[PDB]
């Protein structure tokens, strides 16, 4: 017979980034006006620059 429903484009709720991401603030629907997180080179092992 005639086909009324056979499927279609399916909407997915979540996009799961399968990779390690550096820390970030809000972007997209909510944009964060504050400064980005400061990357601090702390907890050094060998003593450089001192």
């Amino acid at each position: 017979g005639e086909i009324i429903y056979d499927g279609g484009l399916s909407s997915k709720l979540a996009d799961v980034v399968d990779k390690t991401t550096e820390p970030h603030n809000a972007d997209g629907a909510v944009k964060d006006g504050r400064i980005a997180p400061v990357k601090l080179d702390l907890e050094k092992q060998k003593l450089d620059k001192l």
Partner: protein, 50 residues
């Protein structure tokens, strides 16, 4: 040995030496950790989203 040797020197028996009949005193146990363990080479990153 009885005629030509004049003077003899004696020391306490070294603990290194062990008779062959006492071989079971040399049996010892060593523990090697499981091969399923994985050792981590990556640092831990601290972050917050406020």
């Amino acid at each position: 040995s009885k005629m030509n040797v004049s003077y003899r020197l004696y020391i306490k028996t070294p603990a290194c030496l062990l008779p062959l009949s006492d071989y079971m005193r040399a049996q010892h146990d060593y523990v090697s950790p499981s091969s399923s363990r994985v050792y981590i080479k990556d640092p831990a990153v601290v972050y917050t989203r406020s």
